[PDB]
Design a protein around this ligand. Structure first.
Ligand SMILES: [Cl-]
Ligand SMILES: [Cl-]
Ligand SMILES: [Cl-]
Ligand SMILES: [Fe+3]
Ligand SMILES: [Fe+3]
Lengths: 569, 566
């Protein structure tokens, strides 16, 4: 029941124990790497999943055994026989929400602002990419308008998702036995550009909604081998959306999920253990939001990014290519850590709260991820500030905290996570800078991970909406498209089963809850502050419910009751 | 890194530390009960499975997803279409060893001495039970002999498995939807008597089944005595006897007398012994993950809708009653359930020999191999405790050890009324026997009853945990459909394979190889000698398996865990 205190304020015998405790934690929490990704060398037993967590995780795996027994899907690398079969994969599981409406263009587009990866869409400024040769004739034909691309861009109506990150990927390979011999096949890579337009009129109703304009499946334009597809292209348009969804799913899993929630949190958990005493106020604040994070990252090391793991079998590129994308997304996040704060991140894509027209309306008014995440970001910020101000009243105490200074030096260190863009001037000198750091770490661990992890089942457990790999080249625009052509593009049965298995495991339960730690703060002042944060969460929950009532489709993933306290699944 | 020491041999400051540590442990290891079974209230995080364990357990679960994906079995309460379908449940799993030869009478009988439940067979003395009216005409017709039942009993040739303990079971019920209507059905329970005979001729002598009476009260029409000359009726009779053996195995031999009887010893260790107490340092490596696996059994095995509810013959309530009665009888006669005394009480111990000095049951691989492990463990804990206890007064004056015993004997501490003589632990050799039996149960015994489960109970027709139709009339015609209706429906056969695969996927630890070494150099030396003996025992068992009809691998030291952990 020790009261938290800064190291400078203690007695040389108190300081001695802190150093002893820190020395013990350093031995227990040793730094390691797998394929260049920072991870703990050996996991401490105290950091393992609880018994309660294991019981829930086992219920999800047993439920997959039962659902597989009921299902007609087979353990083969053959395609499905019918498109309808993809809808029979859930006899004993909840039906994914996107399954009925996934063919609709609005449903396709909405996923950009309310699906599993609401992190790619950016507003177009000045012009389109020169490798994306959309013409005025195309835009006017799709929008049934006389407006030009330049006029639409000048008014902030055009948005784009550019998947150039996957352009350098080496295509994944798979093999199997079919009649005594070994078959070797290769996945098809795509790095599409997708143009979206915001339509105030909407489809029939006056609500308004983002609509997709064009898709170019690969980066280098060519009128024959890589044309621009539009909604008027019919079946070809449908296939183009499949490849775009595959791109979004690969960026989601590599960049948005694994890299920028799970793995960028690992250095902060390790630096907290390696530099902060158990009774340090920052350790007492951050640790609830690290519960099971080291453990779930070890499972990702063993099951997700391993040879034969989920990323190896399901994603578009080779395991080596996927890990290269993951590490590059980690480095850019760490180099520009402060710039990936939620308001600055949205503003850099031109879809922040500040991006408005002359009237003051946002260019992208319907962004449920943005609106709900902003509420959680602001509430966490207030909570962190009140908490830290209980222990930091003057910025000199920030500068005089040796454990905190070591904590920052460990993070910016090459072997400690290389968070080069953590602080300004090479040192942490102000309370408000530490407020922003702790705010972003808590926001990533809870709200952000909730927003990318939980929609995975609703949108990626139904394979046709977002297949993690495509298994045939895009058909020629002139070429006829049968059901078999699509079934050959979509994943074979065994790999579709593997994708459902992965998505079900990720969203089967909530290991903890935002603002509700296992152990109450020893300090009464901290407990009152935590209580205030919980009260704000209840208010935010009610506001989101009100927002959901008027929204086209409810967006439930950032409801406080659905946000975990930590990245733990 | 604190040298182990007895509490009375410590300074008052040191004693205060032990009392504080013990008080902390008492708060973390609180006693709780589920359906009258002593369990832990809250599992401490340090007692959870490791990350390494969870990785192995997840591999086994994922393998069942993949094996299910490659199977043609469906999620229905219908029977299989063909008996052959039971052999196609393992496209991506190891084929159970018993699958090819389970119809053979010798393979049926040898499971009594080398199967998952080698704990039931007992030698017949004086007479058969009066409710088991086997006649000289039956015995002579089966053995193709003129010897009488009395003469064979006088020579110690006859053995019996009497499953009367299952006679008071309430039959289990299952229900399911069919055409908008809810079908409700009931399992069929049996409490058979099975007569076996030791046949020297066979060359190598082997045990042979002679008669099966499916239920306890004899009746020539509704419960006759079946013999190998009854064809398909004999085959069905063996099914019901195997079902009985499986239910006694899971309720009595596995859950009750490995997992659950170990629980009070783990909690008493945490509640009465300091961390540097020599007995705690000796036993804790053999308790690794035991509290955790018992919590999973509480949640998945004996729970409403759990494995025992779905798979076993009786209702969950009926099964739990059998479990608790086995626990209580074991605790009341704890010393008597030591391995040599247990075997001797069933008349199949090393001392049950004829006039020539030959054992009445020469083929008993469980007995021979377990005796080797029992003797080696006994030497190991004798030398270990000799390092800390040199004279009897130390045992008497060890206040933590005396509280340890008093906690175990107490009603809320597991009621181990037969743990100790004279109401008090007074001698060193008594503690040797207690620790030897606890370590033998947690490692060797659990290995013997747990790991044959896949090889003998994952192939459903060899040992179905429940039967789903009454035994047909002795003169009724038997079709393949009659047997398929007796065997479990598809969904429950899948559930049984699911259970057996998780139980035998991996070995969480290994006998004589703890995670952390003893801080005492003398203690480490004792352990090293124990490992050397395990190596020697491994070679001797390998030689025995070369000279045996079928190899018995489950008590090889490399296959025996250090603790009951799966
Ligand atoms: Cl067009
Ligand atoms: Cl075209
Ligand atoms: Cl007969
Ligand atoms: Fe996740
Ligand atoms: Fe077991």
């Amino acid at each position: 029941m020790v009261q938290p205190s800064l190291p400078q304020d203690d007695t040389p015998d108190q300081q001695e124990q802190r150093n002893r405790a820190i020395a013990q934690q350093r031995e227990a929490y040793q730094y390691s790497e797998t394929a260049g990704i920072l991870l703990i060398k050996t996991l401490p037993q105290s950091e393992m999943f609880s018994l309660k967590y294991l019981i829930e995780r086992d219920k999800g795996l047993v439920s997959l055994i039962a659902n597989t027994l009921a299902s007609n899907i087979e353990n083969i690398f053959d395609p499905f026989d019918k498109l309808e079969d993809f809808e029979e994969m859930f006899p004993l599981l909840p039906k994914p929400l996107v399954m009925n409406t996934f063919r609709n263009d609005r449903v396709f587009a909405r996923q950009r602002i309310a699906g599993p990866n609401p992190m790619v869409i950016e507003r177009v400024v000045d012009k389109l990419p020169d490798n994306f040769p959309v013409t005025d004739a195309m835009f006017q034909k799709i929008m049934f308008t006389k407006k030009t691309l330049a006029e639409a861009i000048a008014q902030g109506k055009l948005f784009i998702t550019n998947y150039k990150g996957l352009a350098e990927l080496s295509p994944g390979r798979y093999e199997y036995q079919k009649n005594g011999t070994l078959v070797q096949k290769t996945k098809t890579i795509a790095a599409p550009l997708v143009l979206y337009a915001w339509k105030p009129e909407g489809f029939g109703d006056y609500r308004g909604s983002l609509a997709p304009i064009a898709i170019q499946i690969n980066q280098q334009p060519d009128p024959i081998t890589n044309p621009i597809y539009t909604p008027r292209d019919g079946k070809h348009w449908f296939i183009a959306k499949i490849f775009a969804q595959m791109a979004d799913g690969n960026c989601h899993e590599a960049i948005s999920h694994l890299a920028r929630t799970h793995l960028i949190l690992e250095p902060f958990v390790l630096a907290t253990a390696n530099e902060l005493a158990p009774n340090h106020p920052l350790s007492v604040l951050l640790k609830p939001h690290f519960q099971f994070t080291l453990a779930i990252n070890e499972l990702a090391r063993e099951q997700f990014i391993s040879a034969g793991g989920y990323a190896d079998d399901l994603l578009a590129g080779t395991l080596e290519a996927s890990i290269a994308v993951i590490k590059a997304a980690i480095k850019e996040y760490m180099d520009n850590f402060t710039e990936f704060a939620l308001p600055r991140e949205l503003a850099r894509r031109g879809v922040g709260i500040g991006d408005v027209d002359q009237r003051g309306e946002n260019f992208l008014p319907d962004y449920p991820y943005r609106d709900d995440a902003m509420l959680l970001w602001n509430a966490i910020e207030v909570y962190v500030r009140d908490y830290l101000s209980l222990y930091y009243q003057s910025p000199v105490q920030i500068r005089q905290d040796t454990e905190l200074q070591n904590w920052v030096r460990r993070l910016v260190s090459p072997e400690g996570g290389r968070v080069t863009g953590l602080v300004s001037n090479g040192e942490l000198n102000t309370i408000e800078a530490l407020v922003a750091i702790a705010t972003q770490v808590i926001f990533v661990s809870g709200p952000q991970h909730a927003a990318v992890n939980y929609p995975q089942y609703d949108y990626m457990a139904f394979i046709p909406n977002m297949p993690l790999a495509t298994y045939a080249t895009p058909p020629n625009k002139e070429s006829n498209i049968s059901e078999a052509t699509i079934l050959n593009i979509l994943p074979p049965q065994k790999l579709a089963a593997r994708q459902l298995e992965l998505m079900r495991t990720l969203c089967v339960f909530y290991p903890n809850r935002l603002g509700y730690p296992d152990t109450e703060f020893v300090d009464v002042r901290a407990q009152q502050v935590l209580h205030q944060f919980q009260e704000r969460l209840q208010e935010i929950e009610q506001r989101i419910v009100l927002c959901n009532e008027k929204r086209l489709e409810p967006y439930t993933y950032l409801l406080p009751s659905n946000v975990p306290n930590s990245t733990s699944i």
